């Protein structure tokens, strides 16, 4: 089987990345690396550990044989951030390993938060959509928390994240709390909290309805 | 032992047999057999197949004279492994041998030069 | 250039037979085996199966008991069929060329070296309905606005702002499947039209965001 080393490697732009896949068992120098980039297929870049692929540029190389495998980019370019796989051989139940997913680094950035309450369209069609927007933080790790008159919600609401942003480097996330509008409207307090390690403390955005 | 450089399909074969299957002759009919040791251990995989064709005798014939000394049990083990499993697979056992009869040829050229 | 062609259907219900077709263009199907891959929501990329010129194949043991891989050499095309479809199912579907040959020690390699751009298949029990779009009125010293395109199905929507004229700031999320089966998505910004079009309903929206 294979492992990819490590699950995440964040990195500036013009810097070196080394990736590394071993195999449990020997495959010879029969290993290859794929990129894929969100939304598109994967693209075969490596084969048989060293040699580049149709059209892959020379900051690609390969090295390693029996059990370890590294993948190097010389020189990282804006197009390079995206997941790595490896694959040897036909291998199952997982032919490809986990994956590396080659992120940019960037200085820690505090989200600006934003709190939506449900517009009136809505309201007078019997549901109520509140909107807690998290803007253009880094890294990705935060934590957003609903209540309503302060009392702590659980399986109501639903998260979404950006891809990072190329220009800038961050992410931006979206948590939608859904009620109805009978059970909104017996409420007064909306508030969603958020934590990141960009702020000094957790804050909190809220309004009355 | 040894056969010389000198000495139609064609490798198109993995169009008609899936590559990724196991084959008969395969790295572990080498296991614990040394490299000065080879030809002898592909020798006698020749002589247990055609005995049990007109390129194959005419590398066989020559082969008459290989022979290694000391204790050649270590090499026999791993042939009646092969043997073993040409007949256990009954007819299979034998077309699964005559379909991989290149291979056998492959291994032979390799080992002997 | 070789170009492999998936074609199928984005959307089924559960219990259909998911069936695709690829077609392999500027190369010849001799010499290569030919495999199809799916990559379900948040995975690697799934191998589940391969088809050889003489018509053997190889299955993924987990959909053994569902899958059938075959092909037309006289149409250049191979086909994926698997059955009784779930929700576990939704993913996208790749087909691959495969080169293969004999290398290391009696051994040998195995590279998907030319894939298809990929065919979404979703599996859901769920009907065509457009989206409502609504209007959503700490640093900076900014302000955010947006819209939340909300209830659709299937996917997608595509948002612009201001016809398209307005781009920068401009985060629209990755829709969420809610728990009715429904998709919902927004579409933020920090004049403000957001233009919402979802051509399964033949929706066109544009929906005018005020403080």
Avoid at chain 3, 7 to 12: C, F, I, V
Wanted: aromatic share 10%; with cysteine.
């Amino acid at each position: 089987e294979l492992t990819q080393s490590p699950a995440t490697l964040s990195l500036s732009p013009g810097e070196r990345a080394t990736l590394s896949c071993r195999a449990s068992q020997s495959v010879g120098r029969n290993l290859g690396w794929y990129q894929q980039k969100p939304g598109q297929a994967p693209r075969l870049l490596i084969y048989d550990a060293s040699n580049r692929a149709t059209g892959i540029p020379a900051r690609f190389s390969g090295s390693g044989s029996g059990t370890d495998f590294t993948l190097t980019i010389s020189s990282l370019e804006p197009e390079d951030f995206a997941v790595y796989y490896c694959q040897a051989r036909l291998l199952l139940p997982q032919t490809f390993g986990q994956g590396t997913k080659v992120e940019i680094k960037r200085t820690v950035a505090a989200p600006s938060v934003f709190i939506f309450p449900p517009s009136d369209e809505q309201l007078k069609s019997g549901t109520a959509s509140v909107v807690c927007l998290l803007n253009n933080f880094y890294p990705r790790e935060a934590k957003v928390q609903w209540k309503v008159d302060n009392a702590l919600q659980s399986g109501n609401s639903q998260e979404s994240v950006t891809e990072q942003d190329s220009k800038d480097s961050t992410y931006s996330l979206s948590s939608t709390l859904t009620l109805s509008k009978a059970d909104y409207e017996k409420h007064k307090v909306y508030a969603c909290e958020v934590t990141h390690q960009g702020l000094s403390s957790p804050v909190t955005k809220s309004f009355n309805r | 032992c040894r056969l010389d450089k000198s000495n139609m399909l064609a490798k198109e074969a993995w169009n008609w047999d899936d590559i990724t299957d196991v084959r008969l002759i395969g790295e572990k009919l080498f296991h614990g057999v040394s490299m000065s040791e080879r030809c002898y251990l592909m020798k006698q995989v020749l002589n247990f197949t055609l005995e049990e064709v007109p390129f194959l005798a005419r590398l066989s014939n020559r082969l008459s004279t290989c022979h290694i000394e000391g204790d050649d049990l270590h090499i026999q083990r791993n042939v009646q492994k092969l043997k073993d499993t040409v007949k256990k697979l009954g007819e299979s056992g034998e077309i699964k041998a005559i379909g991989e009869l290149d291979l056998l040829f492959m291994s032979l050229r390799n080992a002997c030069i | 250039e070789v170009q492999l062609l998936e074609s199928g259907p984005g959307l089924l219900k559960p219990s259909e037979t998911l069936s695709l077709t690829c077609t392999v263009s500027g190369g010849s199907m001799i010499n290569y085996y030919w495999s199809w891959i799916r990559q379900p929501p948040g995975e690697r990329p799934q191998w589940l199966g391969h088809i050889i010129y003489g018509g053997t194949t190889k299955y993924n043991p987990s959909l053994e008991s569902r899958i059938t891989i075959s092909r037309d050499i006289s149409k250049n095309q191979f086909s994926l069929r698997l059955n009784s479809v779930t929700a576990a199912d939704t993913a996208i579907y790749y087909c691959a060329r495969v080169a293969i040959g004999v290398s290391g020690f009696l051994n040998y390699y195995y590279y998907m070296d030319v894939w298809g751009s990929g065919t979404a298949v979703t599996v859901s029990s769920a009907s065509t309905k457009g989206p409502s779009v609504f209007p959503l009125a700490t640093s900076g010293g900014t302000a955010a606005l947006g819209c939340l395109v909300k209830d659709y199905f299937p996917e997608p929507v595509t948002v612009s702002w201001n016809s398209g004229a307005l781009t920068s700031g401009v985060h629209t999320f990755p829709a969420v499947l809610q728990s009715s089966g429904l998709y919902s998505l927004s579409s933020v910004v920090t004049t403000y039209i957001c233009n919402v079009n979802h051509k399964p309903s033949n929706t066109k929206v544009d929906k005018k965001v005020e403080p």
